[PDB]
Design a protein around this ligand. Sequence first.
Ligand SMILES: [Mg+2]
Ligand SMILES: [Mg+2]
Ligand SMILES: [Mg+2]
Ligand SMILES: [Mg+2]
Ligand SMILES: [Mg+2]
Ligand SMILES: [Mg+2]
Ligand SMILES: [Mg+2]
Ligand SMILES: [Mg+2]
Ligand SMILES: [Mg+2]
Ligand SMILES: [Mg+2]
Ligand SMILES: [Mg+2]
Ligand SMILES: [Mg+2]
Ligand SMILES: [Mg+2]
Ligand SMILES: [Mg+2]
Ligand SMILES: [Mg+2]
Ligand SMILES: [Mg+2]
Ligand SMILES: [Mg+2]
Ligand SMILES: [Mg+2]
Ligand SMILES: [Mg+2]
Ligand SMILES: [Mg+2]
Ligand SMILES: [Mg+2]
Ligand SMILES: [Mg+2]
Ligand SMILES: [Mg+2]
Ligand SMILES: [Mg+2]
Ligand SMILES: [Mg+2]
Ligand SMILES: [Mg+2]
Ligand SMILES: [Mg+2]
Lengths: 99, 151, 117
Amino acid sequence: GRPQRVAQEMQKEIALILQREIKDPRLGMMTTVSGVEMSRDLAYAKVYVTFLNDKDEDAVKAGIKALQEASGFIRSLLGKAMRLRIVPELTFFYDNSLV
Amino acid sequence: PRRRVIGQRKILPDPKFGSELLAKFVNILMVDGKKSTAESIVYSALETLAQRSGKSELEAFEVALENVRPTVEVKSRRVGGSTYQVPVEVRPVRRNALAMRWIVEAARKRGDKSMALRLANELSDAAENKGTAVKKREDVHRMAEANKAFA
Amino acid sequence: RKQVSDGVAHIHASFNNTIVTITDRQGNALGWATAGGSGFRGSRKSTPFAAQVAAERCADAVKEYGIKNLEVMVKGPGPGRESTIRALNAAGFRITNITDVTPIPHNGCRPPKKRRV
RNA sequence: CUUGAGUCUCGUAGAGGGGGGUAGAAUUCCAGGUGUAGCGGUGAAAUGCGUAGAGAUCUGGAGGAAUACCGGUGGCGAAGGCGGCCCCCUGGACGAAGACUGACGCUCAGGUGCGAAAGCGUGGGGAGCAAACAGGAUUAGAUACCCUGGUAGUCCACGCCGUAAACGAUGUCGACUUGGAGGUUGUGCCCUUGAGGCGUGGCUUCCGGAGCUAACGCGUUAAGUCGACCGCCUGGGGAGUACGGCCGCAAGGUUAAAACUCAAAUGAAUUGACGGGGGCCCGCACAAGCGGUGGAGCAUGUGGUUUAAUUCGAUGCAACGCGA
Ligand SMILES: [Mg+2]
Ligand SMILES: [Mg+2]
Ligand SMILES: [Mg+2]
Ligand SMILES: [Mg+2]
Ligand SMILES: [Mg+2]
Ligand SMILES: [Mg+2]
Ligand SMILES: [Mg+2]
Ligand SMILES: [Mg+2]
Ligand SMILES: [Mg+2]
Ligand SMILES: [Mg+2]
Ligand SMILES: [Mg+2]
Ligand SMILES: [Mg+2]
Ligand SMILES: [Mg+2]
Ligand SMILES: [Mg+2]
Ligand SMILES: [Mg+2]
Ligand SMILES: [Mg+2]
Ligand SMILES: [Mg+2]
Ligand SMILES: [Mg+2]
Ligand SMILES: [Mg+2]
Ligand SMILES: [Mg+2]
Ligand SMILES: [Mg+2]
Ligand SMILES: [Mg+2]
Ligand SMILES: [Mg+2]
Ligand SMILES: [Mg+2]
Ligand SMILES: [Mg+2]
Ligand SMILES: [Mg+2]
Ligand SMILES: [Mg+2]
């Protein structure tokens, strides 16, 4: 379907499987997701994660590192959850909400 | 400038006074590679500015220039797929060049039925923190920090 | 109108809205503002900026009750938890603890079918 | 006769099965406290909900269904399947050491039983969910996808149905044939003993050798080397259809053709092509700059129109001060 509708739905699903089904102590901080933008093809998607812990890079760096290392696990969960064709490749990014 | 960010060339110091920044100025208002004409206009304008100032031409020129040097300006950028009108702080040589260009442009558009005369007029004006060049620096700063959202 | 000086803020952070309500420690509510009721609709109805706007609009309606000590309980992993938290933190309030309390069942009821989009 | 197959003894692990209790979250609803104008929903919207007071929040109650965490590249079961906890009844598997029986074995047409989900009959139940349906939208069109509702059904009891990509697309049983890394469950012996070391079984996951295979791959749980029995195949379509029988309340299942038509249909692997991809990385490509063209007059070329003729050719970049 349209990339933005799939973007909204995938934001919902990533937020869900990010709040509940994680066990990495590197993650935490009520990690939210501001949104996710994906290409016209649904093959690739970029998530904009927003952390809470102090914005000091020592921690948000570790958070994005853990997310990128668990991307395979999150992709498997997404593929079983949200019922689409290709299970896009995920790329996490710190959304600098404070500007 | 995609592979190797290229540096800047070294202007040799001004002939009469000895200021490399005055050399950059005379290069900046030089039209059609006519050096001597712009050089004479600048020398005549600086002397006229000095008589009212009662100060050395290099210092009065410096105080007028720093009165025009901006510190922040707008930039059209693309980072998140948006027409980012980001305010960003300027580099020293960049703000020098912008000040010189702005005062040259304001002088050129003033007219005053001469060139050295109008240049000295608006240099003395920018010295007292008034004029279109200063007006345009304040307008740039206003446009920049009217959108503080992206800092 | 009275003085409690120690309340708790429920933040229902839906994927389409954000409902902040400050209540007495025994569940009796005091006031509430919504991201929708703050002059936002459609997408903006569920954006973090509107969430903090709603948080501040709700704080401005309980200040006469005299509180600056809060525990907050968030529900729903919607965008607009971070926002309202930092908002009511920037509203002179002292937050002692923030707690995730989203209702998670132990396989209670069957969820609605996935949207085919 | 005891080596195959069984029996006994002592133990071990297990969502194996049937029955009955019970607990804690959550959804919904009902009644109250607090508390006021929104809630809900979408890519945007409306249908919907609320001034009779919703939503949000706390307390209490009712009811139904399913059992987060543990949870496992785990376990049990012939397969289908099986997931809170507790009791009762009950099936199988495995191990240690013996004792016992003495080929009692393997396979199996017909036959019998079991057999997801949907469906059927009778009665009960009904929170959530949800074919059909009713709306709201979107769209050329929407009888779809999306949204708000929502009946059968999903749940229970007793019968019926007997089909699934019921799959490891791999029949059952037995023997034999190099390795390595795990999981899980027994067990023997030894060390100062927990810890640890050296063994030895069952089940199971993943690499890989010989060998096999069209290749992909399989590889001691074979698709390797052999034996026993059973099922099944014979080009694609017609067609798992017709007819007949048998079965079923029905839906239909099962058994199962031929005429006719076509010269292929197919499996595995190979090289490329097509993206309205991913990027990496370059170029005055953009950016940072300076000067222009687009307006004016004229020069010149072209198109067009005109003319007896306005000779011919060059026509996106790469024709148009071009052949000249
Ligand atoms: Mg939304
Ligand atoms: Mg049991
Ligand atoms: Mg009821
Ligand atoms: Mg004997
Ligand atoms: Mg048979
Ligand atoms: Mg059924
Ligand atoms: Mg019917
Ligand atoms: Mg029935
Ligand atoms: Mg009935
Ligand atoms: Mg519904
Ligand atoms: Mg069959
Ligand atoms: Mg199965
Ligand atoms: Mg088969
Ligand atoms: Mg065998
Ligand atoms: Mg087994
Ligand atoms: Mg192998
Ligand atoms: Mg074999
Ligand atoms: Mg074969
Ligand atoms: Mg044939
Ligand atoms: Mg038939
Ligand atoms: Mg028949
Ligand atoms: Mg220009
Ligand atoms: Mg022109
Ligand atoms: Mg023209
Ligand atoms: Mg012509
Ligand atoms: Mg011609
Ligand atoms: Mg030329």
